[PDB]
């Protein structure tokens, strides 16, 4: 969804499960068109992954599998 309009919708780091949140913080950390509270990414990984050529979440998934198995290889 960030690839369709890079310039206004913000990168999302991860989604929040905090049981301490009241209703205001649940509405606060939810973006427009979002189903719950998330963290807005400020580390620049979306721009990194765009420039190195990732366009799908399945490529991010095979990247995740490859780094867990590469870590398992180093352990």
């Amino acid at each position: 969804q960030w690839l369709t309009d890079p310039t206004k919708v913000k990168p999302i780091a991860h989604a929040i499960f905090d049981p301490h949140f009241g209703p205001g913080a649940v509405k606060a950390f939810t973006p427009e068109g979002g189903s719950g509270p998330v963290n807005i990414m400020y580390s620049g990984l979306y721009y990194f992954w765009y420039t190195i050529g990732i366009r799908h979440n399945s490529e991010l998934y095979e990247g995740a599998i490859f780094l867990i198995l590469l870590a398992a290889l180093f352990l």
Binding site: A28, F29, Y42
Partner: protein
Amino acid sequence: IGPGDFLVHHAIALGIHTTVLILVKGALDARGTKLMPDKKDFGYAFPCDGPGRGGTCDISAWDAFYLSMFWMLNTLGWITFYWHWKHLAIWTDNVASFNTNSVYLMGWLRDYLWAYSSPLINGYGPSAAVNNLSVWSWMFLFGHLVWATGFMFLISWRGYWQELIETLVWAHERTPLANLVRWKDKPVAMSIVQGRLIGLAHFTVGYILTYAAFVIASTAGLS
């Protein structure tokens, strides 16, 4: 670039050079000095050689690491304060604010530190409901708390806490229902180097989280 740029680059040269002074001083004096010519036999981290010969507090090479850590934090504070204000003055179409007020330090206090705090400290409030910057507001006050908690270990030192823990040990061994529960390791005060290192760790953690909370919530709260 202009003259506030000149002044903060000399502040940067100051910070790097003083941090190098403490560290090269801690490296080259580590084996021995005139106050302590056999210091290498006492290792890297040790408290002191006691109150004699005038007094020997912070005489180890570990201690010049320890004191250079505050200078590195202050140096890198001046560096990222510079980067942040010059870029936020570019990003808000207000480069005349940097070019006028970066030469004097109430401009740094007011037009950088007081002015850009406003979306941070209004992250949560009684009259406006919370937004996404309330976590950076809580992290900002958290880092103020952790940084100031460091100052306890940095300023107050050991033998107060050892005498205080001796009263606490008396209070536990004479309280019924509760002297029947005993420690296995004897409660003592933290060591001298330990009090320095824990005070540094709190100072440093509070420094990083205070600045990270401000540099993210002030820049994300421009709009």
